[PDB]
Amino acid sequence: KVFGRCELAAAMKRHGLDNYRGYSLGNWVCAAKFESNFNTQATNRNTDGSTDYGILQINSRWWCNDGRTPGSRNLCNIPCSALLSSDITASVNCAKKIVSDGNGMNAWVAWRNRCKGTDVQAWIRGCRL
Ligand SMILES: [Cl-]
Ligand code: NI
């Protein structure tokens, strides 16, 4: 599924991401835009052999099992394919674990490089939330 900006903002809010660990909703929408272009089916292979999955590009080395990443820890206890669903629940639940892991949203390279320190609440402007 390819979400619209406001549609995704609303779904993320309903799943409790607004101000989760102090990160306002715009941060999450911005991260999703630059990680996946709002596409739940996005996948990208990394140089180390792991793969990133879904709207928030969650990595198979640590967070989910894709059956081809040796030494995967599968900390979210889910197959990576679950992160590609039109229903973002599994992605949100896993992301909550990631952002609680110490480095906050810096875990997402696109967030650090393209969202951090910008006016992220532009991402939710005009939305009926
Ligand atoms: Cl933080
Ligand atoms: Ni990545």
From Swiss-Prot:
Disulfide bridge map: C6-C127, C30-C115, C64-C80, C76-C94
UniProt-listed InterPro entries: Glyco_hydro_22 (IPR001916), Glyco_hydro_22_CS (IPR019799), Glyco_hydro_22_lys (IPR000974), Lysozyme-like_dom_sf (IPR023346)
Summary of subunit composition and partner proteins: Monomer.
Remaining remarks: Lysozyme C is capable of both hydrolysis and transglycosylation; it also shows a slight esterase activity. It acts rapidly on both peptide-substituted and unsubstituted peptidoglycan, and slowly on chitin oligosaccharides.
Tissue expression pattern: In the egg white and polymorphonuclear leukocytes.
Biological processes, Gene Ontology terms: cell wall macromolecule catabolic process; defense response to bacterium; defense response to Gram-negative bacterium; defense response to Gram-positive bacterium; killing of cells of another organism
Family: Belongs to the glycosyl hydrolase 22 family.
Locations listed in the record: Secreted
GO cellular component: cytoplasm; endoplasmic reticulum; extracellular space
Catalytic activity: Hydrolysis of (1->4)-beta-linkages between N-acetylmuramic acid and N-acetyl-D-glucosamine residues in a peptidoglycan and between N-acetyl-D-glucosamine residues in chitodextrins
Keyword DNA damage among record annotations: no
Keyword Hydrolase: yes
UniProt domain C-type lysozyme: residue ranges: 1-129
Keywords recorded for this protein, A-Z: Allergen, Antimicrobial, Bacteriolytic enzyme, Disulfide bond, Glycosidase, Hydrolase, Secreted, Signal
GO molecular function terms listed in the Swiss-Prot or TrEMBL record: beta-N-acetylglucosaminidase activity; identical protein binding; lysozyme activity
Domain of life: Eukaryota
Organism of derivation: Gallus gallus
Primary site of residence: secreted
Residues annotated to bind substrate: D101
Protein name as annotated: Lysozyme C
